[PDB]
Amino acid sequence: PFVNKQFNYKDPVNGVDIAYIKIPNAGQMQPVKAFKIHNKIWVIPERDTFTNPEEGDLNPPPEAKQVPVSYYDSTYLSTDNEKDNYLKGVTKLFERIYSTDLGRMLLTSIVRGIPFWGGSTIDTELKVIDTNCINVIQPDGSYRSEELNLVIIGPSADIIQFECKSFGHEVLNLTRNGYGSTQYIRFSPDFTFGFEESLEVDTNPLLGAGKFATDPAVTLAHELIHAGHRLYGIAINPNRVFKVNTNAYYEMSGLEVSFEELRTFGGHDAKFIDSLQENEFRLYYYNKFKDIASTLNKAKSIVGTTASLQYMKNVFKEKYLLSEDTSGKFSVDKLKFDKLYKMLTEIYTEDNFVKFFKVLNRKTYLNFDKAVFKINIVPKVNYTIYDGFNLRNTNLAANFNGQNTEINNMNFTKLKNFTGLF
């Protein structure tokens, strides 16, 4: 299993994999209980009022400012039972993802994607960037810094605004310079979106109530794909967008969709990113990797005592799949780069995960959300690592009946309709 322990929220802290921690938000916060579910990966069963000091209010200020696609509930994830279920739900989704070859590949890439040690102002020394760590309270009450790659945390005010968040740098664009940075995914396994089975209906803002439910494993995988791009520092600048001209409703409103999202969805959507720009990005990141190899060759000493310079140099040789010659000098192999870049951008996509999970899913990112449902995937009678909602040997096994919110109505509670409100 990906997660060796079946944590209970109330398990006593041990200062190792169950501990109170603080994140480097450059602000002041009270410690929150967190769980280390796998090497380099933690889960914080709390609403995210930490990564952004300006988003510490779980209440909707007015009642007309925010977009139609949003859902608020200041009380969600405030009790121990909710946190226990959150932890169990996230854990189960990680197992579901890990159970597929694609998920195993993605998670392996993520664990290997340690944020680059580029926080040194002296090119002769290798130094970690302190915002890619968390402060863990030890058994003696003292704090110890621990590097990590991923944190799954509860959503902020808007419960359904799932996304990857990471601490920036004063100069460097860590998610776009090949360096990478610790990723914080705002996510909840307790809700999911409803979509329509007919393309003409799903892509129309005036039709459909959301008959089928998106499998939350796909949603988390989608965010993990973003996390992968960001950990390897190859995320596409959000200013690079596609002025949607394939949907009259999108076009009539000048709606734009970032290339990063189209890339992440994959399938036909990725085709909207023209070849000339695609090559532009590839060359750009190729150079960024060259600079990392260059920086590694200049390193003559490591800062800290957590590991040896040789160990860290090897860690990044493996992450970026660099070539090592005679003098131990690093370089970027064109073939290896293209293969790694492609793995992270073309192999790991939402569309491919759908194929592996064998679930019904939106056919394109360019559609209109229909509704949001409350769910509970923790009970095996509701959802399993192997079949999601489409439980084998039951009336829910075929035709995605488990995802059919009308047939499997006991597993979904519609909280809000978005259709007609765009």
Binding site: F193, T219, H222, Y365, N367, D369, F422
Partner: peptide
Amino acid sequence: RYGC
């Protein structure tokens, strides 16, 4: 992000 799930998107619109």
